[PDB]
Design a protein around this ligand. Sequence first.
Ligand SMILES: [Mg+2]
Ligand SMILES: [Mg+2]
Ligand SMILES: [Mg+2]
Ligand SMILES: [Mg+2]
Ligand SMILES: [Mg+2]
Ligand SMILES: [Mg+2]
Ligand SMILES: [Mg+2]
Ligand SMILES: [Mg+2]
Ligand SMILES: [Mg+2]
Ligand SMILES: [Mg+2]
Ligand SMILES: [Mg+2]
Ligand SMILES: [Mg+2]
Ligand SMILES: [Mg+2]
Ligand SMILES: [Mg+2]
Ligand SMILES: [Mg+2]
Ligand SMILES: [Mg+2]
Ligand SMILES: [Mg+2]
Ligand SMILES: [Mg+2]
Ligand SMILES: [Mg+2]
Ligand SMILES: [Mg+2]
Ligand SMILES: [Mg+2]
Ligand SMILES: [Mg+2]
Ligand SMILES: [Mg+2]
Ligand SMILES: [Mg+2]
Ligand SMILES: [Mg+2]
Ligand SMILES: [Mg+2]
Ligand SMILES: [Mg+2]
Ligand SMILES: [Mg+2]
Ligand SMILES: [Mg+2]
Ligand SMILES: [Mg+2]
Ligand SMILES: [Mg+2]
Ligand SMILES: [Mg+2]
Ligand SMILES: [Mg+2]
Ligand SMILES: [Mg+2]
Ligand SMILES: [Mg+2]
Lengths: 117, 110, 197, 65, 141
Amino acid sequence: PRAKTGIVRRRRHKKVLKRAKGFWGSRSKQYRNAFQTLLNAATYEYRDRRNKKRDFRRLWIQRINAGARLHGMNYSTFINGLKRANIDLNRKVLADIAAREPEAFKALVDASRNARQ
Amino acid sequence: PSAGSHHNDKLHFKKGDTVIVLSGKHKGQTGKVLLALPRDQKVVVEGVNVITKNVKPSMTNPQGGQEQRELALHASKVALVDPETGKATRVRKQIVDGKKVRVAVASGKT
Amino acid sequence: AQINVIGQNGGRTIELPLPEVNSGVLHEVVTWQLASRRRGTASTRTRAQVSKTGRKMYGQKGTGNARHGDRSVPTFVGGGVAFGPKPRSYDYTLPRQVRQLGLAMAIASRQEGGKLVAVDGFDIADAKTKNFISWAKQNGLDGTEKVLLVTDDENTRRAARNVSWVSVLPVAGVNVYDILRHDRLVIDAAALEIVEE
Amino acid sequence: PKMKTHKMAKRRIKITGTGKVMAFKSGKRHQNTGKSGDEIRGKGKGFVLAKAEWARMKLMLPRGK
Amino acid sequence: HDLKPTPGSRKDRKRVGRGPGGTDKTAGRGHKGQKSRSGAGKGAFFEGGRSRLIARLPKRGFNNVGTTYEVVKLSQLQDLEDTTFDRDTLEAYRLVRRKNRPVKLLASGEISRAVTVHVDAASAAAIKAVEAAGGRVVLPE
RNA sequence: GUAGGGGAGCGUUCAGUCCGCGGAGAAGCCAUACCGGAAGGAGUGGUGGAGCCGACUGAAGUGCGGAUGCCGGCAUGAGU
RNA sequence: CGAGCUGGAGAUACGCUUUGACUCGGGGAUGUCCGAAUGGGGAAACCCACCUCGUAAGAGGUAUCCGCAAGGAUGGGAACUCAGGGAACUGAAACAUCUCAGUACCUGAAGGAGAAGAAAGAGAAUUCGAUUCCGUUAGUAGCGGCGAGCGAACCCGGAUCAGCCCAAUCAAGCCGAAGUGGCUGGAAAGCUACACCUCAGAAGGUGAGAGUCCUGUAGGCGAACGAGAGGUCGUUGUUCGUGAAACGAUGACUGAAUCCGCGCGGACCACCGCGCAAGGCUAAAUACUCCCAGUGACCGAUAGCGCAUAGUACCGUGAGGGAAAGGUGAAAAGAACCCCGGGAGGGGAGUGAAAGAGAACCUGAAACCGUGGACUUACAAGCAGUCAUGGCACCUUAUGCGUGUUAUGGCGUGCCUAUUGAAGCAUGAGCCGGCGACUUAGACCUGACGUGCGAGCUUAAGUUGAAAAACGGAGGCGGAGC
Ligand SMILES: [Mg+2]
Ligand SMILES: [Mg+2]
Ligand SMILES: [Mg+2]
Ligand SMILES: [Mg+2]
Ligand SMILES: [Mg+2]
Ligand SMILES: [Mg+2]
Ligand SMILES: [Mg+2]
Ligand SMILES: [Mg+2]
Ligand SMILES: [Mg+2]
Ligand SMILES: [Mg+2]
Ligand SMILES: [Mg+2]
Ligand SMILES: [Mg+2]
Ligand SMILES: [Mg+2]
Ligand SMILES: [Mg+2]
Ligand SMILES: [Mg+2]
Ligand SMILES: [Mg+2]
Ligand SMILES: [Mg+2]
Ligand SMILES: [Mg+2]
Ligand SMILES: [Mg+2]
Ligand SMILES: [Mg+2]
Ligand SMILES: [Mg+2]
Ligand SMILES: [Mg+2]
Ligand SMILES: [Mg+2]
Ligand SMILES: [Mg+2]
Ligand SMILES: [Mg+2]
Ligand SMILES: [Mg+2]
Ligand SMILES: [Mg+2]
Ligand SMILES: [Mg+2]
Ligand SMILES: [Mg+2]
Ligand SMILES: [Mg+2]
Ligand SMILES: [Mg+2]
Ligand SMILES: [Mg+2]
Ligand SMILES: [Mg+2]
Ligand SMILES: [Mg+2]
Ligand SMILES: [Mg+2]
């Protein structure tokens, strides 16, 4: 017996192509360039899962430093200050305190510069 | 791949016989065989009947003109009838005379 | 280990293919069986076989085209099949003892059914299917099963056949496939006391 | 096609009971007045191939002889 | 249809090619080379282009078929045959089927009970041990 | 983790058997945010108008992006 | 046979037919011109004659070779057969003997087969008994730049059997069982309720899927016609390559015995065995497949033949090469008539179950071209993605883990191949769709897994049976090595 392709190739193809909507020009309409674009997309996805974990830490840190310095303290000195007084806060959380709740962040500042004295 | 091929170019009924319409839209209506074509297996019965159109041609007559004429049917929607039963009926071949073959039912004969 | 029906009732004979029948060997026997009857009749053309002249189509280099030599090539629409099927055979010789053990184990399988029905003599008037139907009906053959019948009597077969749900086999036309194919087996029984010894 | 027997290997190789492969030591046809007499003696003889060379010989004569 | 073959009876074949699953690109064959190529040939006894081992080795002696003797053991005839005796057409029906060759009897392991044997030859220690147990050995005229 | 060796599987035709659907509408086609560890798989809806899914088993012309590959259709260069 | 017919062709008209048409079967009559062509010629299918009869019209004859005559031959035929002639690539990892291979090809002759055949044999048992074919012996014995590689036969088991004469029943065809009602549907075969035949449930057609509607099947009937010597030199054949070279086979030269004689048995001699050359025919088993029939884990429109038909169109001076091609509908009921337009095309209407089937007519993917709408873009450096967030929009696996779309930030050197090293200014590639590449074989070799038997295991050809399989021990493998 013989077994043509029948139906499989087009299903594969549409699969790729349908992953690829919103891609510019032929990248979203031609199979091969879709499939290709997608390989590179692979790289970018995996990488950036790790990397976004890298990025958000960064952000938190920025905000923290800011709040720190509003009340006359560097960030680094603020964080040894916190570790000294064994306050054990996430910097995600430290950021959110710093940004959202003024007086509270203030209190943590005073506690930390005390731990520094 | 002609229609008669399946039915050995053979008509199960003659021209002039009466026939009951077995299958379709004209179930059971009855009529005289006006035309029967063996090879094509097509048969005319004064009951089917359509409205055909004569289009342009100036013969017959310049204008168009519509028309009422019956449209032939496929052999397999036709049967010999039985004067007694009055219904759709099979056929047996038996003998008469004087060398004549004839057609009976479950109660001869047509 | 089992009874007849009409003209006696012996049948305690026949040792049987234990432990409780094995499907493995059955499989062996059956796939062999179907293999043995395949037509092996698939056939295609190769490059030697396509009607395409072998003349070079045009120049090896020059043209700017890709290089080709012929239009009878499997990368060519309308060419040869690269690796097609040519007519071959599938029929080997399965070891005898395994055919025997098989058949055996078929009967054995259908015994624990218990869908064996040993039979002596029959009773079907003179070669009539309606009478086969009544005979069958007296023996519990409702219609809701597919039945293989094996006998050497011309007319009982001649009575069964046209029944949709009966398949009819003379003498030792028996085989694991046909049997295992159906639900019930009509053995008959006359052949059984000889097919033990 | 039945695999043929490598006729060169007929007169120069031997199958063994276990299933190893033998041949005759070499250098005995004009390397004589060398000699030494113990070489000449040691060479006319016979011996087993090292090992890597076994498969091929086996494939040379399928019948063993 | 109920039935299934034995686990490990039938391995599905190698379909080389068919994607990066899988043996990608080169289907086992490696990169380039005469081994890579597609043609019937080398074949098997071709080393380098060199000068072959078999070609370097000394030929010894001619070839002769001669006669070969079909072996019958004592230990066979002995222990557990209970002497149905030897004759000519009896041995066959028991177990030493050959034809076309003459039969020989050889020492094997042990002798005890006496039997009458019909061979075409036998070893010294075999006739000696078959007589020393009371049995006679028959060579033809 | 490259050549390579090994292991478990996905999908395709045909075949046997079982289940079973289908004009109150099959295969094919189309959309989709659901499912599965992946090949993949279902739900619903639109199309279509007569055939076909699932399960186990068997056999293959069985899975494509490449080969200046082959046939075909349609783009670019250009309203030049 | 028994009512239709008047070819594919479907189209109008003429008409034929129960005094038996049409079709099927079987014989005859006619059968222009060319082609072995054959009266002569010739650029095939055309030109020109002569003779006998005939009233003319017309008819018949006029080639060569064997033969006295009668009669035979010439030409054609895919494969198959024998014969005369006879390659190379290639393999030997170079090449010359060798191998490819007595293959391809050329020529010849012939048949439905042909060849071969009735032992101056094979052979080693003082065994067998025409030939061919299958299994097997057996990759054994041998051959060989003893390299590559080439490779019997006897025995045994089968298929089919045969040995005689000369020179002193199938091809046309006919008969042929059994069902109705209601329901869905455009349409009944499907559903459903009861019902029947079966030596007949093989199959096809019937508005969807029919044992019981049609054609059929099982079974039966069935025809006037119809069919069934030796030698020497030079060489070569079989495993036979100058080898110690027997034997056959001829080109050249030469040339014996006829029965107490002759020829062989692998140089050669004796002995022991087998044989009666120089004279012919022979069916059967075997090969093939143009043609016919049945079947299919063969193909269904790039597949399968090159062709859903065509060796056509087309290309070539010629030899020769050589395509694509398929689908309204159940039924033509093939859209009268109205609207715009010269028309093409379309919109209505009407038919249809559906024109979401209208003749550029089954489905109708993708590339590719457009219309409309959502959110968007005129300070911008970009492998076009990816991540994060904000804006807008939307709500049928959807109010959240959202879907679409976007702004801005972070991050980011296409794929494949080939490589020490690829974004590379290295290779391939316009795009999408289809076609497209690790297979088959042997009864070979060697391992892994599994199964059946197990000191044993197994058959092959074939025989019979065959909607299956069984027999078949010839052979092969273990059994002891050196
Ligand atoms: Mg980290
Ligand atoms: Mg084609
Ligand atoms: Mg693998
Ligand atoms: Mg690739
Ligand atoms: Mg490569
Ligand atoms: Mg390399
Ligand atoms: Mg890994
Ligand atoms: Mg199936
Ligand atoms: Mg299908
Ligand atoms: Mg491509
Ligand atoms: Mg180019
Ligand atoms: Mg192109
Ligand atoms: Mg312009
Ligand atoms: Mg320009
Ligand atoms: Mg210009
Ligand atoms: Mg007629
Ligand atoms: Mg002429
Ligand atoms: Mg050459
Ligand atoms: Mg060479
Ligand atoms: Mg001829
Ligand atoms: Mg000579
Ligand atoms: Mg020669
Ligand atoms: Mg001679
Ligand atoms: Mg198509
Ligand atoms: Mg118009
Ligand atoms: Mg727009
Ligand atoms: Mg600026
Ligand atoms: Mg702007
Ligand atoms: Mg380089
Ligand atoms: Mg590398
Ligand atoms: Mg570039
Ligand atoms: Mg480049
Ligand atoms: Mg390069
Ligand atoms: Mg380029
Ligand atoms: Mg094993």
